[PDB]
Design a protein around this ligand. Sequence first.
Ligand SMILES: CCCCCCCCCCCCCCCCC[C@@H](O)O[C@H](CO[C@H](O)CCCCCCCCCCCCCCC)COP(=O)(O)OCC[N+](C)(C)C
Ligand SMILES: CCCCCCCCCCCCCCCCC[C@@H](O)O[C@H](CO[C@H](O)CCCCCCCCCCCCCCC)COP(=O)(O)OCC[N+](C)(C)C
Ligand SMILES: CCCCCCCCCCCCCCCCC[C@@H](O)O[C@H](CO[C@H](O)CCCCCCCCCCCCCCC)COP(=O)(O)OCC[N+](C)(C)C
Ligand SMILES: CCCCCCCC/C=C\CCCCCCCC(=O)O[C@H](COC(=O)CCCCCCC/C=C/CCCCCCCC)COP(=O)(O)OCCN
Ligand SMILES: Nc1ncnc2c1ncn2[C@@H]1O[C@H](COP(=O)(O)OP(=O)(O)O)[C@@H](O)[C@H]1O
Lengths: 42, 347, 56, 107, 98, 459, 320, 40, 54
Amino acid sequence: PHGSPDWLKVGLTLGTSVFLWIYLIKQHKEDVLEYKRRNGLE
Amino acid sequence: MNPIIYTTLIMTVMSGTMLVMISSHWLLIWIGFEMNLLAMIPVLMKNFNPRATEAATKYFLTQATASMMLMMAIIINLLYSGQWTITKMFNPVAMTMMTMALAMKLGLSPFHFWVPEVTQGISLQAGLLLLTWQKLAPLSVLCQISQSINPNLMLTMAMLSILIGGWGGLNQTQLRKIMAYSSIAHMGWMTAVLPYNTTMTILNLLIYITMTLAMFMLLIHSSATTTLSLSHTWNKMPVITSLMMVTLLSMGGLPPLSGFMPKWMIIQEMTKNESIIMPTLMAMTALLNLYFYMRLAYSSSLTMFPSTNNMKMKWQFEHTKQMKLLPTMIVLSTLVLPMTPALSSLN
Amino acid sequence: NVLQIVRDHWVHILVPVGFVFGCYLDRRSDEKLTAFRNKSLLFKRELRPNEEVTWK
Amino acid sequence: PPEPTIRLQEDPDPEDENLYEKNPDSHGYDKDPIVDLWNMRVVFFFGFSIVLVLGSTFVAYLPDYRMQEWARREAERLVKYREANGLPLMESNCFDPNKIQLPEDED
Amino acid sequence: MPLVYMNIIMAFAIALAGLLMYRSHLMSSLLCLEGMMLSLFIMSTLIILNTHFTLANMMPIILLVFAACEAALGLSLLVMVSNTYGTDYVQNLNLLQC
Amino acid sequence: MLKIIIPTTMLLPMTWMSKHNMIWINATVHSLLISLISLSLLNQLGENSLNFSLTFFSDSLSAPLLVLTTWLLPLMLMASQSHLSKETTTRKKLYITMLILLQLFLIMTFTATELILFYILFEATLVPTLIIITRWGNQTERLNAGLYFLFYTLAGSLPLLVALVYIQNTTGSLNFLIIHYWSHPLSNSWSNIFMWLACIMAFMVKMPLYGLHLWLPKAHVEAPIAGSMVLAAVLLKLGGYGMMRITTILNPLTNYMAYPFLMLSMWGMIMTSSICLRQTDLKSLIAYSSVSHMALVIVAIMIQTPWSFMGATALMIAHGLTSSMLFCLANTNYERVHSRTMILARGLQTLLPLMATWWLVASLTNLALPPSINLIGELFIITASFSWSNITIILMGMNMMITALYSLYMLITTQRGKYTHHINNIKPSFTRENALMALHILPLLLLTLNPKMILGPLY
Amino acid sequence: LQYGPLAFVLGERTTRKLTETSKVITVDGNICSGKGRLAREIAEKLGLRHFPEAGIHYADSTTGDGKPLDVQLSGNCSLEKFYDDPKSNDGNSYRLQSWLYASRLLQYADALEHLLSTGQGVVLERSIYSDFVFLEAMYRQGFIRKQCVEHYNEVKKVTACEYLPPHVVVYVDVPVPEIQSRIQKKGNPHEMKITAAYLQDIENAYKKTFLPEMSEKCEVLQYSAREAEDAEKVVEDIEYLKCDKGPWPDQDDRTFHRLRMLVQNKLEVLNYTTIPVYLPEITIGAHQSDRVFQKFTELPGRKYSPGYNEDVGDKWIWLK
Amino acid sequence: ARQWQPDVEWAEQFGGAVMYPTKETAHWKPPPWNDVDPPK
Amino acid sequence: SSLLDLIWLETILPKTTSFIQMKMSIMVSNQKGLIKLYFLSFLITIMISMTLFN
Ligand SMILES: CCCCCCCCCCCCCCCCC[C@@H](O)O[C@H](CO[C@H](O)CCCCCCCCCCCCCCC)COP(=O)(O)OCC[N+](C)(C)C
Ligand SMILES: CCCCCCCCCCCCCCCCC[C@@H](O)O[C@H](CO[C@H](O)CCCCCCCCCCCCCCC)COP(=O)(O)OCC[N+](C)(C)C
Ligand SMILES: CCCCCCCCCCCCCCCCC[C@@H](O)O[C@H](CO[C@H](O)CCCCCCCCCCCCCCC)COP(=O)(O)OCC[N+](C)(C)C
Ligand SMILES: CCCCCCCC/C=C\CCCCCCCC(=O)O[C@H](COC(=O)CCCCCCC/C=C/CCCCCCCC)COP(=O)(O)OCCN
Ligand SMILES: Nc1ncnc2c1ncn2[C@@H]1O[C@H](COP(=O)(O)OP(=O)(O)O)[C@@H](O)[C@H]1O
């Protein structure tokens, strides 16, 4: 019809994507650190 | 019906399936089956017409007979060993009773006769539910007791199901009957690997559910239940017909599509057990399913059928309601072959 | 004209870029197959004074 | 029989269109003369000039990774050595018999 | 396994065969399922009482209840079919075919 | 090998992000550049192979096929430019996408260090060809043709898969290098006989074998020009390549099991060459000629001697080029006359002299005139067969005679005589068609200067 | 919140919107008559919403911009040609009849949507009911074939079996001599050629079949030309009678929810208007269909969804 | 000059109740367009 | 051209397969929709299954 870009939905979509990416980067960092500590590499 | 009542009935069906999946007592599994059957009938009769009532009564008769047979198997197993836990049966007769009850619930040949008629009678959404969600509980029970099954009987019913589905799909113009025969053939493929590997059974089930969901949602989007009605879709939604053709190619087991993953794996598994003849016959018979999928593709997207004049008006309108998971279902049903080793997740 | 024909000829650059990326990926995959470098009986060679690896 | 004999509403079969009609010097690539000319030019330059000539010259001057001259030189020095020492040129055994252990039959 | 158990089992088998016959009168089909469940109740009760398994004294009643609920639904279905044809004949349900 | 695969993949977004009137130019230019890049695979070794990675490896049997596959795409685009003029941009982009996907699958198939990966890609090539045939074909028989081209293939290919997995369950691997190095003899057993059949029949059906060749005339006649070109040039050679790869595990059982296929091929070459003499359709005649040439290649592979393998490789390359050229000539006639009946348009030498020269050179290469690579492969196979048995010379010479007969019959019927009077729409040949013909024929006469590039790994 | 099951669940109910004034009504009259004037006058007097009689390009007025499209893209039929040469070889008569029936179905769906969503009643000219009379006329004059009437009956059954008929029907009675005199007085050259047999056959259909069948399930107000001039009496007649014999009082809140879901989503309303029955007057070949569909797509605001058309002037496309 | 596309006669092959009609199944009828039968 | 290629090679592999699959499909899919016959077959199969295996 005749509707504006719903900035609530846009903001929620961007926020979900950014939160997921930040969470993934963090999770990878502690995954690497935990693996290194457990296997006695560094 | 009322949306509240519809949601309650859908959650009751899911709770029955869940009750079957999480319980360790045979009585609770039987209760879950009863709950699922009780809540499933109004879903099949959501749109009132004589055909839907006939489909619902046939489905009820079949499922109630299967439930009585299953309870007979449970009681005989209790008689020969006072056990209620779902595990190896310990009785030869009880296992056969259980196998026939679960084959009747699944629709495996020679208990297949109800599936095409029930699917034709009910609507497309009811058929989607019946062909996707209603296979989880019997297959889960079969997986739990796979060490008990006689391989001869299970493999006989699997090969019979594949043959019957392949032959019965060749004679159909109705899309719902085609889906029903396809489901019978896929159930036959699923149950032939239970004696050897339940992981392959689950992988085949997941791939089949994905493809069936995609195909049913495409059929609902382009609201067609016959071949000739589907032949008109290119004149309004050619992209839908293209997606449907790719999905049909995947359902026929062609590489590099997703539908090649199960059969391949299943064949591979069956070769590790020195079973060569049976997978060969299964593939040769699946060629029939591919033939009628290809006929549908010819009639839908690879050729342009004549249209009517009123179609012009349909050019001016767009769908109000959309399926959110349809693109994901299409992609997962066509392009997941490179991710095959992920089956180690014991899906 | 710059900033105008780019919007009409941007597609042309893609194939050449792919060729470079494929070469880079081929070298990167080569770097994972060095388990026998300077170890084959045919080409056991003593390294030059200012050499690290016989081949890359 | 009031039937029209017209089985359906159909467009008539169009007649084929000549590219030479609206454009002599048409090169048979496109009905747009500019795109036609540039398609001809790119096909001729990248097909006849680049691939056909430069690729053929590149194939002609490929280095001897098949080792034809290497094998010829090896055979030349080997024949020179055996002829000088009176050895019987090629031997009939491909491997030395002393290092093969046959199974004793005792039949 | 004594003779009473085999008698109840053959009663269940007779009821199942009678259901699978379908002469006519879908009401008779419901009656055959009903005899099947009655035989199941009798034999489960005998097994549970004989072995003195105190807790499963629950499950016969439960079985009855659930089966009885099923019966209700079947009756409804039968009734509705009759509302379309005026009779509960089996042969009227041939609109859907293989 | 990724330096060739990645640009072929990038051909797709470039095609779909192109202007409506630049798709042909961009596709042709970048496909030609990909061909030029792939031309550097020809630098092969006298030793094992070009083992790029665990997944892809190159060989002097694979390299000529790869180069021909990369070279065929620009010619297919040039041939398709004409008859797709009146069609929408999205559908033309889809057609080019199908061609690009076919090239990608063929490229990955020819390297394919794994036998299961080879099977997957070798069957993945089926889908684009079927869509091209059943979507952009003209007559009503195309659908039927597609069905044949489908099921025959699968009827051969489904047992092979089973055999393949069976081998890996016993050997432990399906890597071609490990298979070659760890090969063991096959005992004369019924189980081994059926394993042999499951390994062979899939590649036999796509050559095609004489008894199993029914799908080829339909598929090649009802396909569009690009489809016919790719079917005759590259897709027929998949069976030969697969047999050359797979016969390493079938010894010594090949000695006994080769007899029925050898008889079928030796008699079917005569049968199909004779069929060519009585043909009312140009495309069907060219298809039957392809069947005869592939019968000769089957004989060569079954004999499994060094000269046999060299001749088979040379003949596969030469036949691909010659058959593509012949199909292009037939299509140039068809787009003018719209009939595809050989007897209808006559005496075209007086109206199209340069096209008559192209017809003559194509017939000469099909006739296997020395020192063309067609005759190089022919003669190597014939000499190997003569060493196999001196009586093969009768059948081989008869095939040569009939081949010359039907090639010159095809040339004389269409080019010589008197022009048909009522046909007045024979327009002068376009620069596109002449360029296509030259781009077919110069590679052949230029490959006759360096034969070792197409003589395979046993050179 | 676009209306759906969730709106029904939370608050949205239409039984509270019905204020005994809705009264979906329709007006039936002979070709060239006061039914249009009477329908409008009823619409202003009763506070209802008037729906002008559906034409060839009624659907064009509700989609995109309201301006009509070309004849080749909308309808592929013309009333002027039907009047000029009703026995045409290309089957314009039945194509016109089918397109008009589909337009009336769409307009009835729109009227029902408005009434159920707002509670305000509507006034209509010839609806999906009584659209058959012209068909019968065309059959009795020989303008169309029989297979046309079976196809029309099939489509009409499958479509009209799912909507509620109007509360009261208003019929304006006009004799044929005076109808022809009024036709001649308009001055339309194409309407000049309507034969009196066609008008008489059309008149016969309304009285013989249409009046008794709507009398038994609805309420009927037979008016003449003189008594249709004063709308006060007609409005008083509408107010005095109370609809208690039709299916409307038997409707309830869930059936209203189902009907409101049906009236939206116009694709499902028009679903059975294109059933695969191959009548030469209406079936279209693949080549012509493809060409016309391509032409329709190239229209300014018709390539994409309404909010995603740059050439029209939609902005923020890459964020919608 | 024009690619063949299915006509009405080609389409009517797929319009029956089942494919491959037989003497016994000749009298079968396709289901209604909407899955509703007249109550008679 | 005619006896072998157009007739007998067609008769052997493709036409025979098509005919056999056609007949089998006709036999399989031709049930009148009467659940009496269905459940009679169910009894038959159930009876056969119990006896053959054990
Ligand atoms: C065709 C694509 C299908 C995709 C499937 C749907 C994707 C969406 C699913 C959403 C997330 C699912 C994760 C669930 C969270 C917790 C998982 C946990 O509860 O279950 C565990 C296990 O979770 C599942 O096993 C993992 C599911 C992952 C499925 C992916 C494999 C599919 C094959 C590869 C195809 C490519 C798909 C990837 C592209 C998306 C433990 O199971 P367990 O209680 O101990 O035993 C039950 C199973 N048994 C009986 C077989 C042993
Ligand atoms: C119009 C009338 C005629 C006018 C023109 C007159 C001139 C004619 C002269 C040309 C033809 C006469 C033949 C004489 C040949 C001279 C050149 C030849 O001797 O060089 C060849 C060299 O050429 C190459 O060998 C052949 C070219 C390879 C062709 C590659 C094809 C191009 C790619 C296109 C795509 C592929 C499509 C097909 C897929 C398989 C062979 O040389 P060779 O003794 O050996 O070694 C080369 C030099 N070394 C010693 C340093 C190594
Ligand atoms: C139709 C278009 C072409 C399609 C492809 C055709 C090619 C397929 C041909 C198959 C190759 C040969 C098959 C079997 C070869 C075995 C050798 C046999 O022929 O000789 C005798 C075999 O004897 C008899 O043949 C026994 C079998 C008799 C039954 C066979 C049926 C005869 C005609 C069937 C042909 C139909 C082919 C198509 C089937 C659909 C020797 O007897 P013996 O030395 O003691 O045992 C040798 C085998 N051992 C050592 C493993 C034990
Ligand atoms: C163009 C259409 C052609 C259709 C296919 C043609 C090829 C047919 C080849 C046979 C198909 C299946 C063969 C099995 C695949 C290989 C597996 C294998 O070799 O294992 C064998 C298994 O061998 C078999 O099981 C073979 C059974 C074959 C059954 C199907 C017969 C199909 C038709 C037979 C007659 C025709 C045969 C040649 C036809 C050529 C094509 C015309 C031995 O393993 P084990 O038994 O575990 O170890 C021995 C100790 N127990
Ligand atoms: N279902 C139909 N079939 C044929 N013609 C129709 C149909 N519906 C409307 N028309 C045409 O619409 C025209 C205008 O309708 P009408 O009410 O009679 O005139 P006016 O708009 O001036 O009041 C008429 O000429 C009539 O024939």
